């Protein structure tokens, strides 16, 4: 609406091509107490994640006899947003903690550890669009940093639509002012989707163009995750 999202030169507000990702930076083992940890930055969106466990889950009737229980928290610091965010969990945070947990549930080989919990705490230090996915990937990386067995790593990206153009990896302006916003996460080697949402509106053809563009970004991100994890042994 208010701002032009696709400029006359065909480029976006931040100068990117529609199939171009924001830059990515990843740190592992950033916390001393956590069993595993990571910081993931995608553009100016930055999360930190910490994993503890597996460890026996003390309210035992909440435990699972054949499985580890994943306990996940998506939280935004009050200074992560343009206007101060109240630290009390919001409905969004509650929904996103579930969506992220369920994404992790497909990856973590929880059946190794009957009666345990694996805690995953994620805090968003800077929110500039796509924090649920940055958060989820930080989680994947921290689980791996903790040596918790997993099917695959999780890479994800929001594709969307801006001034009628399918774009890859939205920024704030595009998130606030665009026509569509579609976070997708996968286990890329297993061709399995673990998180999938859309808000806004798209024709079915557009939805499919966008999904197709997500997979390209996701695989670029996956390769950066792999190399990030390998880095300290190289």
């Amino acid at each position: 609406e208010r701002p032009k999202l696709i400029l006359d030169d065909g480029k976006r507000t931040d100068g990117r091509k529609p199939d171009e990702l924001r830059s990515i930076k990843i740190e592992l083992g950033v916390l001393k107490n956590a069993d595993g940890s990571a910081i993931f930055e995608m553009g100016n969106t930055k999360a930190i994640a910490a994993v503890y466990g597996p460890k026996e889950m003390h309210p035992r009737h909440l435990s699972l006899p054949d499985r580890a229980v994943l306990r996940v928290r998506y939280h935004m610091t009050p200074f992560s947003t343009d206007e101060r965010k109240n630290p009390a969990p919001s409905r969004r945070e509650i929904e996103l903690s579930k969506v992220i947990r369920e994404a992790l549930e497909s990856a973590v080989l929880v059946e190794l550890f009957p009666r345990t919990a694996i805690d995953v705490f994620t805090e968003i230090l800077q929110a500039d669009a796509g924090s649920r996915l940055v958060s989820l990937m930080a989680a994947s990386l921290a689980l791996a940093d903790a040596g918790i067995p997993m099917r695959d790593l999780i890479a994800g990206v929001a594709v969307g639509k801006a001034d009628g153009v399918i774009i890859l990896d939205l920024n704030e302006t595009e998130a606030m002012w665009g026509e569509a916003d579609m976070p997708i996460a996968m286990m890329p080697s297993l061709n399995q989707v673990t998180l999938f949402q859309l808000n806004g509106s798209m024709t079915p053809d557009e939805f499919r163009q966008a999904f197709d563009l997500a997979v390209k970004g996701i695989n670029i991100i996956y390769n950066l995750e792999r190399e990030a994890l390998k880095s300290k042994y190289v």
Binding site: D35, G36, G53, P54, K55, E56, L109, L112, F113, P114, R115, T116, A144, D145, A146, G147, I148, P149, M150, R151, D152, L153, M187, P188, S189, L190, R226, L229, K230, Y233, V234
Partner: protein, 207 residues
């Protein structure tokens, strides 16, 4: 058609290791999906005769196995035994009747055998997916650790510290030490063995 894709490679979750119907023992560090094998962890791909495995490079928990010698930290003194921290996802328990060699007596309740903050060297007598690990103090050189230090490391790193045919063990004990399956080691005058054994944690992937 049955092959392997890597030499001694640094490996990562989801990473393809091999294709074909191998006859490999189950491991937590590998995932077989039909005729493909994948790494579940950040680790080291290694091959042995016609089999293969991932050596995890990462991980701070110990997964119990029966007959492992393990050094535990007593956490709670219960009415009929003691709850022990063996650095696993499950707490271990040592029953009083084991450490004593007979049933508890009316006039007991001492912790003079074991208290909170004591270490115990012990063997896992019982464990499986359904139950928490049960300990026995029977064997020689088991029970309360009176003297010594206890250095903590990743259980994942224990085979490196022993070293193929107890050879790292040798090059430690020639300069300075019991290595438990637990990522804990028991141990002259303030010689800093640990400054070394930490260096092996943080360089296991080399030489």
């Amino acid at each position: 058609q049955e092959i392997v894709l890597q030499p001694r490679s640094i490996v990562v979750p989801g990473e393809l290791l091999a294709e074909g119907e191998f006859q490999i023992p189950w491991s937590p560090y590998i995932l077989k999906i039909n005729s493909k094998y994948y790494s579940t962890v950040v680790g080291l791909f290694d091959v042995k005769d016609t089999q293969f495995e991932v050596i995890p490079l990462e991980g701070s928990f110990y997964y119990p196995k029966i007959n492992d010698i393990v050094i535990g930290l007593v956490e709670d003194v219960e009415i009929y035994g003691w709850v022990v921290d063996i650095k696993a996802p499950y707490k271990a328990y040592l029953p009083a009747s084991n450490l004593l060699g007979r049933s508890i007596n009316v006039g007991e309740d001492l912790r003079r055998y074991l208290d909170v903050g004591d270490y115990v060297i012990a063997r896992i007598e019982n464990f499986d997916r359904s139950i928490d690990p049960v300990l026995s103090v029977k064997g020689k050189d088991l029970g309360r650790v009176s003297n010594g230090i206890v250095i903590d490391i990743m259980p994942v790193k224990v085979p490196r510290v022993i070293g193929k045919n107890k050879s790292m063990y040798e090059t430690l004990t020639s300069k300075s030490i019991f290595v438990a399956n637990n990522g804990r080691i028991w141990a002259f005058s303030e010689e800093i063995l640990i400054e070394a054994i930490r260096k092996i944690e943080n360089e296991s992937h080399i030489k």
